[PDB]
Amino acid sequence: MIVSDIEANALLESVTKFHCGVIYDYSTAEYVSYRPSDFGAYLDALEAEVARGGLIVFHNGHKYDVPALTKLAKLQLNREFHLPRENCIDTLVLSRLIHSNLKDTDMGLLRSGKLPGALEAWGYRLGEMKGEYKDDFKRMLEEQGEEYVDGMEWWNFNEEMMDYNVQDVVVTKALLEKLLSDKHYFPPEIDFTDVGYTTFWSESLEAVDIEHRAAWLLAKQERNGFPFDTKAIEELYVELAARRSELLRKLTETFGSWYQPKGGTEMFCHPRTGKPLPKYPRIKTPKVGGLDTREYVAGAPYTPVEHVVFNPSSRDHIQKKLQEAGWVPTKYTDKGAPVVDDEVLEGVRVDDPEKQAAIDLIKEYLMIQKRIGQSAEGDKAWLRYVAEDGKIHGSVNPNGAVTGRATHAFPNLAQIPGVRSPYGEQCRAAFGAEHHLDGITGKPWVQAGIDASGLELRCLAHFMARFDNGEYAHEILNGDIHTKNQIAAELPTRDNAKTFIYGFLYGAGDEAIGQIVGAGKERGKELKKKFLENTPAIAALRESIQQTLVESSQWVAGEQQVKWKRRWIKGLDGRKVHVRSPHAALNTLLQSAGALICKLWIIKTEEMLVEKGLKHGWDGDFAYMAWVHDEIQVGCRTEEIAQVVIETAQEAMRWVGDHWNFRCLLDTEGKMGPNWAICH
Amino acid sequence: KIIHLTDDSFDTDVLKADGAILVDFWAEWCGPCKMIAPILDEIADEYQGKLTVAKLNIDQNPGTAPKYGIRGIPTLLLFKNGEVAATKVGALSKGQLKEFLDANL
DNA sequence: CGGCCAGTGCCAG
DNA sequence: CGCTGGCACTGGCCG
Ligand SMILES: Nc1ncnc2c1ncn2[C@H]1CC[C@@H](COP(=O)(O)OP(=O)(O)OP(=O)(O)O)O1
Ligand SMILES: [Mg+2]
Ligand SMILES: [Mg+2]
Ligand SMILES: [Mg+2]
User: Fold this and answer.
1) Of A347, A495, A367, which is closest to residue A422 (Cα–Cα)?
2) Is residue B73 within 8 angstroms of chain A, CB to CB?
3) Fewest beta carbons within 10 Å, which of A11, A395, A606, B65?
4) How far apart are the C-alpha atoms of A382 and A228, rounded to whole Å?
5) According to the UniProt entry, which residues carry N6-acetyllysine (chain B)?
6) Nearest to A630 by CA among A601, A658, A609, A654
């Protein structure tokens, strides 16, 4: 086993030069540095470790180092270099699995200060390498009279860079050993720094294997990117910006501007008693002035103010105009500010008709800015992330949620507006295989969208089969459960029938329930009874969870103090799943189960396609474009191939279900089309 | 003796009035404005002959002040023949105003 | 005036 | 007590 780390001139997207590399061989216990001129030698060393059936450890190598070395090998040396997935170990992947209760900076992409809780120390030092090296650069630099530029600390190699590289390996090694010391994932009988790759995956907890495979596949997905129609979105921006301009015109005619205190630098004091009056706007006393054209005197105080135009985006402004119009809030916030959301906005009533109608313009205005913000103006807007290849390469953290679910960001391709919502079809149609032209033929590609049917209800069925002998599981397989739940709860749409149950099943209050299905707390109660009564096994399951985790707890003030017997649960693959709160214990169980099922699923799916002879990549037959929890979107070179993907996705799901001996049959539904609009 | 303006009455009551007009842009929430009000009441009785004191409440009439660059309050704009002749900002003393007036009328 | 940050509210599974 | 997440926009604070 060897630990390694490399330094390059840029991010994967445009890396073009290998600076240096360090390798620590457990077999010799020595560190070896490699400078620019040693690139071929560094690569040989890695392949030597592979020829021995060894292991190579990197910290975040699945997303950067490994795929960067392949690219750099072809560009700088005309060499074909491909480390096999089975030989690589990633401490970031490991760290995220064994310390899943903690956040991380995603290797410096996030600021540690805005992250909740504590951070694992070694991993922290690793994610801050660049910034620390940069600060040293600007320093060593300015102490020379030079000027710092862009990010010049990365354009050329240097011994300062070499030392950090060495330091990373020494820290990554320390991080490795601390993770390998967790007896729950790695049995203490084996010395994992001294065994071949086959032994590492077979003797360690199954989760270690599943997390590395998922990570290897999702890094590929990130590299495939999602075909995006820029022209369609730029033209959508124009429509919305125009509609936005008009609503502002209308609103700013209805609600006029006003003045506010600003720049007061002195407490106002009563002229007679000298008593301070904090509640009054601060003032300002001239000094000087007293023909004297100047517009000030001397002991004549005034109150500095500013002119402010109505801003529909400001909840403060809205709340201020509607009260003046006659509204009296009934719902306030912790800080005493009134609640202004679509829910209350839809129920606000006033006299002035123009003002009342204005409210809709306000709701439409906010919704439109929600769209413009995500697609065009916001920091993470689509139009800002579209790469040169006409694809958006969104980032994915395979194990960012406590439950084992993945997290998506920059931008979050997992929060794109649904087709059944304002402007969703246009947003949705903008992402799609049709927007990718084949490298050879030039013809458009096709999309294959597969989604796991009634996933978490089947997960519930599985866990309550030991209480109801498999009954819930039986009823599930009798037509769409969400549609059979819709009519039952006399609900409108199927999406809403889904929102209901999942709010119901994870302990949502009677009011919360009634709101969703949107009557009073009376409705959201008869409905909790009707369904909770139509299935008492859910009550048994809940008690076990409690009797297994909690010992007892108080309620001392606005918080919670609990005495646990054990504060985590065992996942479908044996990992520990942290339970933050007794009331959410059930959710943790089902969400975690669903997540692990979908993770093995996409893994098994791509594995079966490559087995059927298919090549993964835009230069092949299919390409993973996105994975949204229990849904995958795959681009296919021909209709024929999309037919196979779909068929194959169903085979893999049934496989997973058998793998973990699930007490509820698992199923998938696939659609073939040109984009995400038609494929979901 | 004091005139109370509105956005719609401003033009003819001020910009088309004969002689001098002393306009006060004020607001209920300002301490300095509350201090100067008393003074203005007396300045009205006294200059009843060669001056018209008129007030405009900036909250109830949001359209006029903007056109004048109101930056602080109370603001005292002295109009003559529909044109701003003078201007001073703050709670002048009864004794300082009279001067400002005398030295401008 | 752009960076930091709290308070809020919406988008998806 | 819905719970997992990301993220945008307002408004107070400060170099
Ligand atoms: N509002 C919610 N609260 C909690 N969990 C939810 C909520 N909505 C969805 N989930 C969970 C259920 C399983 C997972 C994906 O759900 P998805 O949206 O695919 O529906 P589903 O899988 O239950 O059924 P379908 O066959 O209609 O897609 O996310
Ligand atoms: Mg590194
Ligand atoms: Mg599904
Ligand atoms: Mg889905």
Assistant:
1) A367
2) yes
3) A11
4) 9
5) 67
6) A601
